[PDB]
Design a protein around this ligand. Sequence first.
Ligand SMILES: CCC(O)(C#Cc1ccc2[nH]c3c(c2c1)-c1nc(N)ncc1CCC3)CC
Length: 293
Amino acid sequence: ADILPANYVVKDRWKVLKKIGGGGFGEIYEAMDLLTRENVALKVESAQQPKQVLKMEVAVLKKLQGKDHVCRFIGCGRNEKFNYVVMQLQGRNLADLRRSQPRGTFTLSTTLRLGKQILESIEAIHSVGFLHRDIKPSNFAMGRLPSTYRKCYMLDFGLARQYTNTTGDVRPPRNVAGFRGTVRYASVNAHKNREMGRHDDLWSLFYMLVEFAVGQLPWRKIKDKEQVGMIKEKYEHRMLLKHMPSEFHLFLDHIASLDYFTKPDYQLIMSVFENSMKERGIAENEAFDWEKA
Ligand SMILES: CCC(O)(C#Cc1ccc2[nH]c3c(c2c1)-c1nc(N)ncc1CCC3)CC
């Protein structure tokens, strides 16, 4: 029941090698580019699928071309059986890299430098009028070339939503919006089924970086969406920062102050990461934890 079989050739050019991801709303393959001879990522959506989301994902990817932390767009197409997008292939995701560490923790040097790259990518998608709405470690992947192996890329615009109108104004929020994303890194606003905003993507970043540095979140053993929301709603969030740099209070206080309508202070959050690095003599050119160095 896979949309493309192995060795299936798309548009006489992209030859399916294997499936590398899958879910309700489509499938991702590693393919060989029979023209440029590199391997690529080939993402497909059934032509029959009721919710046609790939067209929006491609529009977002095209708007982001020229930004850092963005997969190169190679091509896209539509036919009677499937829609597809061809993009730059990336490597190891941050969730797998964190689980591979001895205590499931990154150093503060790896955590802060990843934080800077993820924040850049979040500001980038916001800058073209979209929310990601499922910011989580498995949606960020390190490069797989000499030119990219220390670069972190944003993946999966499947749950993204335009927060502006045709003319660049902020859209009215729906009084109820069903949160359909991942439980562990969801904001309290998402748990309450409120329209998500730019701040909710930064809430997900906040929770990610605590988990990277400390190795866990307090609710990690609880899978039920309602229970997790009730735990987060009361949790004294300053407690999450007991073993984090003190600058992180500025980050917590800022995003706590935001509502659906308010543009975040991305530079304030960047300065938290940069000041936390400078205080501890952490340089940008340092080895990541997973490197031999
Ligand atoms: C326009 C399509 C887009 O929304 C997407 C995706 C995506 C979703 C689910 C996915 N799942 C995977 C990948 C992946 C990508 C992936 N992808 C790329 N480019 N290298 C490597 C991998 C890792 C393998 C798994 C843009 C970001």
